[PDB]
């Protein structure tokens, strides 16, 4: 690769780091690029999981231990002589499982910040503050205001006398040993609430109130970090930054954040990143260059820290950090934070006793941390799950004979008819269908009748191979749960490495075109082979050692094709041609019913199904707002549209499942008991889209299920030019005919639809049946909080109450009522979410569903 890509947050001094990068290009001739991507917390583990991303990542050490569990970070091997150049505790912050996993850069912690004019000598102890507030109240001021809403800010006091998140021992944090409940933590929080009850502090004080008050000279003290200094620097306040007050003679223990630089485990530039960080960045001039852009605060490098500590504010930061506790670098901190946030809010407001608040927090944090471990175990079993065994040597031989017989029938039939047909559409793979004509001779669906424009059909790209052998066909059919029309289908093998490369190229082309079908996407398209009118399946083959995660410890089958040995196969795409009939009648009828009854909501794209639109404050049950209203306002049958949606989802599913037996297996694996009532019928669909003569840019979906179904049907007669569905990383494209369905892995296969031009009245209706997991999780959560069957009654009540406010007092009053409901809903969702209530099985590393399922390992030993 011979280059270095670095990700750092936008709030840091990246241009200063970019200057350090130049000086690196000088000596080694290696370019250093420094990007600052938004949502960086979540972006790195999602991209690094696939062997992609930067060489170097810059973030707080706390996240890095989770990354280390996922093997996304390289073990750094610094010499004992380099390790001396940094404070030993900062090295402790970047240790996971005996191993060093990142380079410490900067050190941050809360300090006491005080107004020098109101308070020349800040108190040494918390115990003095009540007396000090009494004095300052007489002058119309207050002693102390800081954020009471987030436990980060209140924890220093709580930790002082004892009290910790998880007990650290032998290089590990004990998940089962939470320190929320001890006498130490109890005393700390007691003192905090005593300050509130004795009117020294207000329970509603948040970050903004505290910052405003201190920066305007209204309060003598606040508690904040180095990020807050810039704002105070613009104000009239003469301020100092000092050691946090002691409690019962012990130091307040703020959490310590260590900004760190980790090396990507999938980076080919490991020894040159080691070079860059050790010799160019972790030096006085190195950190100086960064410091001059945006200040680092305290730093891990002893020599430069001695310089910075000349600023008393930096000195105070380090001192508080050393008296503090390194923030645990494990994901189970989320459990700690939610439970402690609830406890502090409750104890401060009087909703619970300090003793009651901490007792519940201890119990809940331990429970939630235990469950999250259990969920990670189960996810591994999900990723590694195998289809029910249908494959055997005798079964594949049997199936190959059947398939061979069917190929002869299909040939004889083709001979008799003068060629191949999909419905009435003449199918010739020598040609690419660039435009085509549909006729509508009756009120049924318009039918593809004639190829209009064509070019000679481009060959398959080199990484995609049509499978010739019936034995191999039967091998894959039986192992992958795919049963296409006998003698009338093609199977393909796609090289997994090249598939991922082509995905990247496709995304690049769309970006270059400016998020649109332009020249670069067109050039890719010109290389895609037409499979219009075909029934096809694409298997990807992963070589045993990536985007794909097969378990090579899984059971192996013996392939008839030796080229499959040492490889795992998964189904990435399947194109079906549904014969016009009862099922297509039912499906198209439901679309018409849902369109007529105003049940498609506009987001463009029209949508329906079991959504939960959280932007709608009053939404508390499954569906779009139109669905909620119809359940109430209907004078015939409240459930009518839900019967329609279930039949729609179930009929499409049934058609797909006849051909793809892995689909119900996927449904059963990833939909939880709590998610089932919020899926549309017995399917893996919760949302259904609808498009009218529309293209869509090439893209990967992110927050959808493992497989997505798309179908098309046509309404009037006419000619359509363009509008191909394109799978550029598979090197194929097609025109939808009478009733074409594609089932494909939408999170891992790039896809889109070219713009259309039409002649006549022809409408091509496109529709995706998919799993949008955010809706099913939130709904499963609401179901756990209120009861699945209570949601309709809540929705009816919430609609009535919002209507009343509008009818009585205006739009403003009603939207305030909706705003109230939204907060209450939020709190309920949040509480269930903390209890690990889920609608679907998800990757704890990525927060997404697995990239594929049901991998089959093939091995042919001699």
Ligand X SMILES: O=C1O[C@H]([C@@H](O)CO)C(O)=C1O
Q: Which residues are annotated as a binding site for L-ascorbate?
A: 689-691, 751-753
Task: State in angstroms the smallest separation of the CB of 604 from ligand X.
Answer: 10
Question: Closest CB to Fe ion among 288 and 701?
Answer: 701
Q: Does 661 bind ligand X (CB under 6 A)?
A: no
The Cα 527–Cα 512 span in angstroms is 18
Report, in Å, the least distance between residue 700 CB and Fe ion: 8
Which residue, 63 or 754, has its beta carbon nearer to ligand X? 754
Q: Rounded to an integer, what distance in angstroms lies between the CA atom of residue 846 and that of residue 801?
A: 40
Footprint (CB under 6 A) of ligand X, residues 704-723: 710
Residue number, 26 or 511, with CB nearest to Fe ion? 511
Q: Which does 54 bind (CB under 5 to 8 A by kind): ligand X, Fe ion, none?
A: none
How far apart CA 178 and CA 360 sit, in angstroms, is 12
Name residue 714's beta-bridge partners: 764
Q: What share of the chain is helix, strand, coil (3-state, %, to 5)?
A: 45, 25, 35
Query: Using CB under 6 A, which of 689, 693, 717, 806 touches ligand X?
Result: 689
Query: Where does 5-123 have alpha helices with state H?
Result: 14-28, 40-48, 61-69, 80-83, 88-93
Identify which range of 37-45, 48-56, 372-380, 749-757 contacts ligand X by CB under 6 A. Answer: 749-757
By a kind-dependent CB cut-off of 5 to 8 A, residue 753 interacts, out of Fe ion, ligand X, none, with ligand X
Q: Which two tokens stand for residue 436?
A: 């085509």
Among Fe ion, ligand X, none, what does residue 689 contact (CB within 5–8 Å per kind)? ligand X
Asked whether position 461 contacts ligand X by CB under 6 A, the answer is no
Q: How many CB atoms lie within 10 A of CB 561?
A: 16
Rank residues 672 and 689 by Cβ distance to ligand X and give the closer one.
689
* Position of minimal CB gap to Fe ion: 701
Q: Does residue 696 touch ligand X according to CB under 6 A? A: yes
- Please enumerate, by residue number, every residue annotated as part of a binding site: 689-691, 699, 701, 751-753
Contacting ligand X (CB under 6 A), which of 267, 644, 686, 753? 753
Between 324 and 728, name the residue whose CB sits nearer to ligand X: 728
DSSP single-letter state for residue 280: I
Nearer of residues 264 and 767 to Fe ion, judged by Cβ: 767
Provide the β-strand partners of residue 103. 261
What is the Cα–Cα distance from 629 to 586, expressed in whole angstroms?
Answer: 25
Cα–Cα dist 373/166, whole Å: 15
* Contact flag: residue 735 with ligand X (CB under 6 A): no
Nearer to ligand X, 347 or 730 (CB): 730
- Can you give the binding site for Fe ion, defined by CB under 5 A? 701
751 binds ligand X (CB under 6 A): yes
56, 263 Cβ separation under 8 angstroms: yes
Per-residue string for binding with ligand X, 547-586, x by CB under 6 A? Answer: ----------------------------------------
Element (H, E) at 819: helix 811-834
**94: partner contacted, choices ligand X, Fe ion, none (Cβ within 5-8 A by kind):** none
Question: Does residue 767 touch ligand X according to CB under 6 A?
Answer: yes
| Positive or negative: CA dihedral 482, 486, 488, 494 | positive
Judged by CB under 6 A, the stretch of 191-199, 322-330, 581-589, 748-756 that binds ligand X is 748-756
**For residue 28, what are the CA distances in angstroms to 82, 151, 287, 807?**
21, 46, 20, 73
Judged by CB under 6 A, the chain residues 274 through 303 that form the site for ligand X are: none
Please tell me the distance from the alpha carbon of residue 419 to that of residue 482, in angstroms, as a whole number: 26
Nearer to Fe ion, 392 or 702 (CB): 702
Minimum Å gap between C-beta 503 and ligand X is: 15
Binding site as annotated, residues for Fe cation: 699, 701, 751
Give dist(CA 819, CA 814) in Å, integer: 9
Compute the least distance from the CB of residue 627 to ligand X, in Å. Answer: 19
Among 675, 766, 783, 850, binds ligand X (CB under 6 A): 766
Distances (CA, A) of 3 to 17, 24, 502, 765: 16, 11, 21, 47
Q: How near is the Cβ of 676 to Fe ion at its closest, in Å?
A: 24
Q: Is 772 in the site for ligand X (CB under 6 A)?
A: no
Q: Which residue is nearest to ligand X (CB)?
A: 766
Site stretch for ligand X (CB under 6 A), options 14-22, 151-159, 558-566, 747-755 = 747-755
Rounded Cα gap, residues 578 and 96, in angstroms: 54
**What span, in angstroms and rounded, lies between the C-alpha atoms of 70 and 57?**
15
Beta strands in 186-310 (DSSP E): 219-224, 239-242, 246-247, 250-251, 255-263, 298-299
691 binds ligand X (CB under 6 A): yes
Cα 2 from Cα 209, distance rounded (Å): 50
Residues 6+ apart with CB under 8 A from 735: 433, 436, 448, 530, 532, 720, 723, 724
Site residues (CB under 6 A) for ligand X?
605, 689, 691, 696, 710, 725, 751-753, 766-768
């Amino acid at each position: 690769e011979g280059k270095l890509v670095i990700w750092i947050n936008g709030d840091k001094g990246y241009n200063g780091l970019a200057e350090v990068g130049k000086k690196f290009e000088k000596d080694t001739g290696i370019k250093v690029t420094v990007e600052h991507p938004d949502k960086l917390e979540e972006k790195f583990p999602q991209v690094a999981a696939t062997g992609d991303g930067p060489d170097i990542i810059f973030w707080a050490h706390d996240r890095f231990g989770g990354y280390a569990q996922s093997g996304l970070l390289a073990e750094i091997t610094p010499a004992a002589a380099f390790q001396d150049k940094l404070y030993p505790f900062t090295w402790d912050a970047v240790r996971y499982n005996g191993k060093l996993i990142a380079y410490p850069i900067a050190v941050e912690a809360l300090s006491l910040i005080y107004n020098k004019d109101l308070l020349p000598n800040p108190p040494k102890t918390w115990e003095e503050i009540p007396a000090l507030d009494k004095e300052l109240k007489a002058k119309g001021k207050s002693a102390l205001m800081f954020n009471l809403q987030e436990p980060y800010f209140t924890w220093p006091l709580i930790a002082a006398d004892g009290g910790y998140a998880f007990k650290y021992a032998a290089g590990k944090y004990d998940i089962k040993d939470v320190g929320v409940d001890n006498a130490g933590a109890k005393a700390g929080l007691t003192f905090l609430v005593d300050l509130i009850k004795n009117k020294h502090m207000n329970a509603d004080t948040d970050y903004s109130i505290a910052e405003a008050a201190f920066n305007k000279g209204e309060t003598a003290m606040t508690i904040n970090g180095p990020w807050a200094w810039s704002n105070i620097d613009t104000s009239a306040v003469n301020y100092g930054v000092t050691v946090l007050p002691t409690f019962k003679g012990q130091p307040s223990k703020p959490f310590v954040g260590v900004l760190s630089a980790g090396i990507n485990a999938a980076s080919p530039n490991k020894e040159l990143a080691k070079e860059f960080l050790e010799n160019y960045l972790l030096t006085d001039e190195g950190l100086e260059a960064v410091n001059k852009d945006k200040p680092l605060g305290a730093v891990a490098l002893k020599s430069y820290e001695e310089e910075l500590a000349k600023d008393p504010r930096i000195a105070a930061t380090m001192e508080n950090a050393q008296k503090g506790e390194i923030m645990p670098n494990i994901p189970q901190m989320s459990a700690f934070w939610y439970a402690v946030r609830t406890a502090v809010i409750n104890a401060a407001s009087g909703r619970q006793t300090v003793d009651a608040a901490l007792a519940a927090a201890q119990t809940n944090a331990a429970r939630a941390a235990a469950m999250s471990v259990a969920l990670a175990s189960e996810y591994q079993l999900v990723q590694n799950a195998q289809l029910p065994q249908r494959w055997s040597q005798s079964a594949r031989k049997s199936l190959a004979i059947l398939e061979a017989t069917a190929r002869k029938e299909a040939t004889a039939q083709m001979e008799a008819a003068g060629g191949s047909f999909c419905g009435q559409f003449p199918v010739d793979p020598a040609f690419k269908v660039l435009s085509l004509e549909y006729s509508a001779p009756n009120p049924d669906i318009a039918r593809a009748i004639r190829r209009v424009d064509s070019v000679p059909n481009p060959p398959l790209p080199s990484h995609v191979v049509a499978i010739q052998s019936t034995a191999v066909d039967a091998d894959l059919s039986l192992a992958m749960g795919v049963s296409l029309t006998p003698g009338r289908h093609t199977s393909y093998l796609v090289d997994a490495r090249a598939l991922q490369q082509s995905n990247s190229a496709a995304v690049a082309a769309r970006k270059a075109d400016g998020d649109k079908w332009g020249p670069a996407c067109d050039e890719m398209f010109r290389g895609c082979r037409c499979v219009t009118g075909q029934e096809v399946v694409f298997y990807t083959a992963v070589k045993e050692p990536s985007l794909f995660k097969p378990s090579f410890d899984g059971p192996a089958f013996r392939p008839s094709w030796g080229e499959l040995s040492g490889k795992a196969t998964g189904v990435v795409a399947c194109v079906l041609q549904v014969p016009i009939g009862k099922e297509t009648d039912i499906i198209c009828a439901e679309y018409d019913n849902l369109v007529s009854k105003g049940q498609f909501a506009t987001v463009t794209v029209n949508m329906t199904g079991n959504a939960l639109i959280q932007n709608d404050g009053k939404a508390i049950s499954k569906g779009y707002a139109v669905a909620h209203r119809a359940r109430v306002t209907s004078n015939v049958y409240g459930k009518a549209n839900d019967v329609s949606l279930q039949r729609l989802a179930e009929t499409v599913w049934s058609v797909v499942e006849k051909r793809l037996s892995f689909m119900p297996a996927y449904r059963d694996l990833v939909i939880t008991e709590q998610g089932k009532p919020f899926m549309l019928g017995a399917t893996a669909t919760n949302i259904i889209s609808l498009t009218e003569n529309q293209g869509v840019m090439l893209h990967l979906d992110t927050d959808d299920g493992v497989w997505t179904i798309i179908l098309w049907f046509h309404r009037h007669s006419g000619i359509i030019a363009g509008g191909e569905f394109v799978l550029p990383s598979l090197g194929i494209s097609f025109q939808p005919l009478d009733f074409t369905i594609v089932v494909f892995a939408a999170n891992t296969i790039v896809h889109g639809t070219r713009p259309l031009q039409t002649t006549g009245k022809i409408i091509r209706w496109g529709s995706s049946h998919f799993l949008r997991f955010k809706d099913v999780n939130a709904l499963a959560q609401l179901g756990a909080a209120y009861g699945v069957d209570e949601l309709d009654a809540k929705q009816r009540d919430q609609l009535e109450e919002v209507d009343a406010a509008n009818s009585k007092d205006g739009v403003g009053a009603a939207r305030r009522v909706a705003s109230c409901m939204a907060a209450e809903r939020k709190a309920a969702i949040e509480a269930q979410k903390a209890a690990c209530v889920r609608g679907v099985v998800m990757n704890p590393c990525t927060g997404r569903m697995p990239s594929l399922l049901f991998w089959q390992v093939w091995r042919k030993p001699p």
